[PDB]
CSV table of C-alpha atoms and ligand atoms in Angstrom, one decimal:
chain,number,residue,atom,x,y,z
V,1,UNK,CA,11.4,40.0,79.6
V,2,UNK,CA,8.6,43.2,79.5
V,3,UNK,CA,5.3,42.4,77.1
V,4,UNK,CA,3.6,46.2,76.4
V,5,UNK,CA,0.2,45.0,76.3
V,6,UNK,CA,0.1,46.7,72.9
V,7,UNK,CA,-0.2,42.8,71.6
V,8,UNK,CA,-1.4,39.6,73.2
V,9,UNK,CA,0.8,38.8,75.7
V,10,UNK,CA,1.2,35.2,73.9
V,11,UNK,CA,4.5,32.7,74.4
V,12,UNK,CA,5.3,29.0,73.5
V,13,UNK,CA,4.9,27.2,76.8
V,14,UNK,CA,5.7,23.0,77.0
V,15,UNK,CA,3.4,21.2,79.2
V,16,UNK,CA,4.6,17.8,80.2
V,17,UNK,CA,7.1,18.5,77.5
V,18,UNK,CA,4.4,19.2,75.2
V,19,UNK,CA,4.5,22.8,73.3
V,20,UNK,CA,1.1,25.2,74.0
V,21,UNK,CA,1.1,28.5,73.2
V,22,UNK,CA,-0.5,30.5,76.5
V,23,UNK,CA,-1.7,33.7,77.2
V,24,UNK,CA,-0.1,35.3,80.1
V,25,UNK,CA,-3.1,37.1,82.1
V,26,UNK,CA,-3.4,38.8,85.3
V,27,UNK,CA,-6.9,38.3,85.7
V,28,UNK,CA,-6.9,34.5,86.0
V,29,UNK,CA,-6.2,33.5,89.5
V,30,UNK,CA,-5.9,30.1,88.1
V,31,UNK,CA,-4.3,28.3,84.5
V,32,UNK,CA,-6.2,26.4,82.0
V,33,UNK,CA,-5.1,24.4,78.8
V,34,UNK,CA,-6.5,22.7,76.1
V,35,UNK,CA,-5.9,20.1,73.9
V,36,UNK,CA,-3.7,18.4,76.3
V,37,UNK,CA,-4.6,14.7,78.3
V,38,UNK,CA,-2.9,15.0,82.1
V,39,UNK,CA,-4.5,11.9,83.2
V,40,UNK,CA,-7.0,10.4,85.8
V,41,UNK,CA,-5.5,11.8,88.9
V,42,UNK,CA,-7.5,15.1,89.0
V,43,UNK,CA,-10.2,16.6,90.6
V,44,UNK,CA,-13.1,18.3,88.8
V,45,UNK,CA,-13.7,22.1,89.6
V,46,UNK,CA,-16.2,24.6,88.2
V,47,UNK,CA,-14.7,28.0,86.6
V,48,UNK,CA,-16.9,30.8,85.5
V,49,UNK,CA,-16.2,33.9,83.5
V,50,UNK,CA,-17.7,35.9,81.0
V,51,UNK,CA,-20.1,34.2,78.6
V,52,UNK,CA,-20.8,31.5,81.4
V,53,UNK,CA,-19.1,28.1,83.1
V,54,UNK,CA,-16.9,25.6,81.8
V,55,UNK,CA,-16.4,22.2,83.6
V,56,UNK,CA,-12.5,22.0,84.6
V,57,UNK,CA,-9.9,19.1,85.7
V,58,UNK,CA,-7.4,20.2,88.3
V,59,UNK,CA,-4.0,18.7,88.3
V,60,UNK,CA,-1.0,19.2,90.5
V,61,UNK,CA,2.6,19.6,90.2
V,62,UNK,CA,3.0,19.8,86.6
V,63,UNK,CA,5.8,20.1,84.8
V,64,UNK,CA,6.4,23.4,82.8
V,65,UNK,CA,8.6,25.1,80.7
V,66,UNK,CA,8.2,29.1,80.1
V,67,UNK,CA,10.3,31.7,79.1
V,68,UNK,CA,13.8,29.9,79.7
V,69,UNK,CA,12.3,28.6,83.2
V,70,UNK,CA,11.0,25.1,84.5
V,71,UNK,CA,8.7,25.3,86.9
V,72,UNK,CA,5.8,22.8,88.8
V,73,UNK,CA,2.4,24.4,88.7
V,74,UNK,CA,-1.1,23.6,89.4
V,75,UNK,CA,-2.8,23.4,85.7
V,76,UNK,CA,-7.0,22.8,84.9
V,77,UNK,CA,-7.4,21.3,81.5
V,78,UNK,CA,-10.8,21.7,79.8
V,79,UNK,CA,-13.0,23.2,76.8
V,80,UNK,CA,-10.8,26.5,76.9
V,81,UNK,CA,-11.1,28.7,74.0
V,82,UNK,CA,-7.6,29.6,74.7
V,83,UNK,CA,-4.6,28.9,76.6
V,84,UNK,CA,-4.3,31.0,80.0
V,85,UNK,CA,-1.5,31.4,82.6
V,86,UNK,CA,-2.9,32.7,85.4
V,87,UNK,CA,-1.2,34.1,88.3
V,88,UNK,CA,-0.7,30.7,90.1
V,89,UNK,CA,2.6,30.3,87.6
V,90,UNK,CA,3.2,33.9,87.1
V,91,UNK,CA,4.1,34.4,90.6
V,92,UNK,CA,6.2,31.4,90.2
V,93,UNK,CA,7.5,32.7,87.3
V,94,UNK,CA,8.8,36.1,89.2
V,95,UNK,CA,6.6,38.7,87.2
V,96,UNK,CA,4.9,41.6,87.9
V,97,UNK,CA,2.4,43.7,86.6
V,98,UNK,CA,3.9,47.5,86.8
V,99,UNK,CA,3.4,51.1,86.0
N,1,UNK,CA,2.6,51.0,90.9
N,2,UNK,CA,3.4,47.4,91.2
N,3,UNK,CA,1.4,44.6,91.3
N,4,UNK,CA,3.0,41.3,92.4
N,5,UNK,CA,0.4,39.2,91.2
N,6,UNK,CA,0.6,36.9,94.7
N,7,UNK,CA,-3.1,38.9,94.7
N,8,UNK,CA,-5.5,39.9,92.2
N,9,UNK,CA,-4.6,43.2,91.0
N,10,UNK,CA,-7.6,44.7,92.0
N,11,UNK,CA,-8.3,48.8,92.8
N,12,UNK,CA,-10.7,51.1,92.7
N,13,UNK,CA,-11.7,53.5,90.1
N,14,UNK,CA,-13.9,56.0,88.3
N,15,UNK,CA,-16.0,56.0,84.9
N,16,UNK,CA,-17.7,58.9,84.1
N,17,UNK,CA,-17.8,59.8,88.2
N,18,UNK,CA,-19.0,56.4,89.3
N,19,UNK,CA,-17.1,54.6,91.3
N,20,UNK,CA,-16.1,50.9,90.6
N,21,UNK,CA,-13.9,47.8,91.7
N,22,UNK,CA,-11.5,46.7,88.8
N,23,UNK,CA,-9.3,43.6,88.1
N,24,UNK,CA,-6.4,44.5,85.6
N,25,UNK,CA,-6.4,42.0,83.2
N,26,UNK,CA,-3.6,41.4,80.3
N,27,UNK,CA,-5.8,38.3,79.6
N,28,UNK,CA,-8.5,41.1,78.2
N,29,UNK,CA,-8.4,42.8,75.0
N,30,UNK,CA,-11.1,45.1,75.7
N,31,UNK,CA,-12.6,46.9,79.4
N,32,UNK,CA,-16.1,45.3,80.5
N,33,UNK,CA,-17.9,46.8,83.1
N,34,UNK,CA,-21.5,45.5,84.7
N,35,UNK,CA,-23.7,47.6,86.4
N,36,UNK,CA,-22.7,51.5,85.5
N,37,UNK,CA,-25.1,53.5,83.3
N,38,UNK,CA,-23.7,55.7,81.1
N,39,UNK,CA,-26.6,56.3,78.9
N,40,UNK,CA,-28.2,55.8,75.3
N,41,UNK,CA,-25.1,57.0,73.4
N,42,UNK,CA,-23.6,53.2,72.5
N,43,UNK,CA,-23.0,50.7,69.5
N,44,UNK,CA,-23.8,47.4,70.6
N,45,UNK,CA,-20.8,44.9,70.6
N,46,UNK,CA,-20.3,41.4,70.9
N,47,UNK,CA,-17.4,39.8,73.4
N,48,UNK,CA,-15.7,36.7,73.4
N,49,UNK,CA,-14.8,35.0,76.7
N,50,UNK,CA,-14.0,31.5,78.4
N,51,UNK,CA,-17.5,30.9,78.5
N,52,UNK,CA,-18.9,31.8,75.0
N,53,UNK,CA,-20.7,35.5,74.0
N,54,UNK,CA,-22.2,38.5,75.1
N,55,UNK,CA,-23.6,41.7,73.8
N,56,UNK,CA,-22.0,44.5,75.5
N,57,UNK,CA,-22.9,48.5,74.9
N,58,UNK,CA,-19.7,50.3,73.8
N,59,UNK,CA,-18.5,54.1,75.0
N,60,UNK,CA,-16.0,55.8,73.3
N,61,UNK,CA,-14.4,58.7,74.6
N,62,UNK,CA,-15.5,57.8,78.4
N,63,UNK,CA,-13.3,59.9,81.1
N,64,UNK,CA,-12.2,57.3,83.7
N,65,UNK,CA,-10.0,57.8,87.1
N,66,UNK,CA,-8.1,55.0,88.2
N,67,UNK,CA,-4.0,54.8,89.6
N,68,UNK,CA,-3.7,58.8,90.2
N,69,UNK,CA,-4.6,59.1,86.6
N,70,UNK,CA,-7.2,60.5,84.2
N,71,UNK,CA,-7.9,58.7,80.7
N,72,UNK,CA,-10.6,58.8,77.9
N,73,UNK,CA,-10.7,55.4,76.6
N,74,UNK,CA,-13.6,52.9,75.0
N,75,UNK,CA,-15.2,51.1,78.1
N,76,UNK,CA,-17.4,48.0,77.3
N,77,UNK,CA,-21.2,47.6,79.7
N,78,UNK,CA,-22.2,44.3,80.0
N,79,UNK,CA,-22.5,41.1,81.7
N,80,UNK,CA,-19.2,40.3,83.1
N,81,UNK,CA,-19.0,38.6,86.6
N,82,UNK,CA,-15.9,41.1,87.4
N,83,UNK,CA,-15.1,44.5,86.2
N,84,UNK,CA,-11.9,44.2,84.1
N,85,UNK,CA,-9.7,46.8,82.6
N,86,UNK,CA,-8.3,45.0,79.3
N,87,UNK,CA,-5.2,46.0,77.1
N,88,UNK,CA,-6.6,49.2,75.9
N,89,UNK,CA,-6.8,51.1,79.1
N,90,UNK,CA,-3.5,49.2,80.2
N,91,UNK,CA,-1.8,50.8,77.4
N,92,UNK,CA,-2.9,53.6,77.8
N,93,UNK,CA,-2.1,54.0,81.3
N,94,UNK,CA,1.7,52.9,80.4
N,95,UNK,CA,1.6,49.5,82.3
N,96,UNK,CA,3.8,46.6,81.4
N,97,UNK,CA,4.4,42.9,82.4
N,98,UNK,CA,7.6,42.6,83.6
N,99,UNK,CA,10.3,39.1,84.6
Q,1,478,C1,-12.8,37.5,82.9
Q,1,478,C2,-11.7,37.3,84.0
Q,1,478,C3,-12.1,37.8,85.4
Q,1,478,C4,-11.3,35.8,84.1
Q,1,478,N1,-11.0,35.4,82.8
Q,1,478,C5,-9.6,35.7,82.4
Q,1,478,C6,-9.6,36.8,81.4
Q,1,478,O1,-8.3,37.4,81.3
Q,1,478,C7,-10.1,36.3,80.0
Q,1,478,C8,-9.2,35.3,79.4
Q,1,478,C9,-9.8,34.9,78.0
Q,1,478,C10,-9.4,35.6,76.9
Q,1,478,C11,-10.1,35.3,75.7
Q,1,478,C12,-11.1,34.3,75.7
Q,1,478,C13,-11.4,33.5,76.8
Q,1,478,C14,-10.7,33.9,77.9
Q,1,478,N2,-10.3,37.4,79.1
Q,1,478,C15,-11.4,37.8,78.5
Q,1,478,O2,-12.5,37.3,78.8
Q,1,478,O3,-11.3,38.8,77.6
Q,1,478,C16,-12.5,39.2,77.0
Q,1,478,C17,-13.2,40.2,77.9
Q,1,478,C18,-12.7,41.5,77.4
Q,1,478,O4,-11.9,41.3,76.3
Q,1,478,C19,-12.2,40.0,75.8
Q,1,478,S1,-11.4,33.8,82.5
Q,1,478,O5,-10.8,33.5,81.2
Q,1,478,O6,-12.9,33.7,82.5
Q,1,478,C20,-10.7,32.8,83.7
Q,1,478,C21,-11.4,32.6,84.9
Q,1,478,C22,-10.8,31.7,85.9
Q,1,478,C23,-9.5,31.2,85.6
Q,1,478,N3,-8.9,30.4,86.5
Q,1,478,C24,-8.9,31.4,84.3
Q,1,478,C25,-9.5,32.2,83.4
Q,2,CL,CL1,6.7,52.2,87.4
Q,3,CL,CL1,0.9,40.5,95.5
Q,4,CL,CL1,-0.2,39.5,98.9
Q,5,CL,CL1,0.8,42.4,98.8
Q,6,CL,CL1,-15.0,61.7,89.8
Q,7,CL,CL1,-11.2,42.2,70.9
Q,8,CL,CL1,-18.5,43.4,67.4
Q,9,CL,CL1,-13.9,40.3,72.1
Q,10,NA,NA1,-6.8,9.4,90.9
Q,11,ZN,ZN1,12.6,22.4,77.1
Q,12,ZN,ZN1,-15.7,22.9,72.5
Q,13,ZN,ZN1,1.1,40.6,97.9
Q,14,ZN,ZN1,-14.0,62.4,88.3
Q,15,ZN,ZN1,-13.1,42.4,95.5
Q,16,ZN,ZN1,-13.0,42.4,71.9
């Protein structure tokens, strides 16, 4: 697997066996999803980037699906404007950013 | 170069001279930096992020240094809480995602 950048680096993810499509992006240290319910065992986090805050709900060991691997990742659900994989499940993934 | 994402791919670089911190972010379309002055020659621009909107000044043509290389490539000024390098100087420095 190699994404050139010259696109979104999009892909169909399942999230507690539910499908999400996620952005895979280096400059998240962190992953946040939307749309999805994980529960009551969480705890509430800030995150901040550009155009301001959004109120977060961090949940451990998750179950995940991505390209043709499982995985168990820390995931944040909230008010997202898109999906994001961050580099918490990209380095449990195995990629790298090269040049 | 690689960049094994266990930190944020993070380095130094130059625009126009001036020396900057910068994240490299597949997560970005576009390359937002706060701070640098780089004059009256702009459009104005509006960004998208996690957060909502800002107004960003946009450069085309703007010489920057970064990874032993020299590009010209659109650079965004605005309010951005990090300095990100987006998809368009990625690509154009030849970097790739790779698992
Ligand atoms: C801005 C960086 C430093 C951090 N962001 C990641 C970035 O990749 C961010 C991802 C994103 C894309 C599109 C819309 C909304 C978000 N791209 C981004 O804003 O693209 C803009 C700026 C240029 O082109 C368009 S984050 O989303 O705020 C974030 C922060 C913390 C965590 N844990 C997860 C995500
Ligand atoms: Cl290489
Ligand atoms: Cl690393
Ligand atoms: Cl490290
Ligand atoms: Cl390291
Ligand atoms: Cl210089
Ligand atoms: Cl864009
Ligand atoms: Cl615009
Ligand atoms: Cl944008
Ligand atoms: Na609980
Ligand atoms: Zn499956
Ligand atoms: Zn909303
Ligand atoms: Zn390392
Ligand atoms: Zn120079
Ligand atoms: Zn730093
Ligand atoms: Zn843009």
């Amino acid at each position: 697997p190699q994404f050139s950048l010259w696109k979104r680096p999009v892909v169909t993810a399942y999230i507690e066996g539910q499908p999400v499509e996620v952005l895979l992006d280096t400059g998240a240290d962190d992953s946040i999803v939307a749309g999805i319910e994980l529960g009551n065992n969480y705890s509430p986090k800030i995150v901040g980037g550009i155009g301001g805050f959004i109120n977060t709900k961090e949940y451990k060991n998750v179950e995940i699906e991505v390209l043709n691997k499982k995985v168990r990742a820390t995931i944040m659900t909230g008010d997202t404007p898109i999906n994001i994989f961050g580099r918490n499940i990209l380095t449990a993934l195995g990629m790298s950013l090269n040049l």
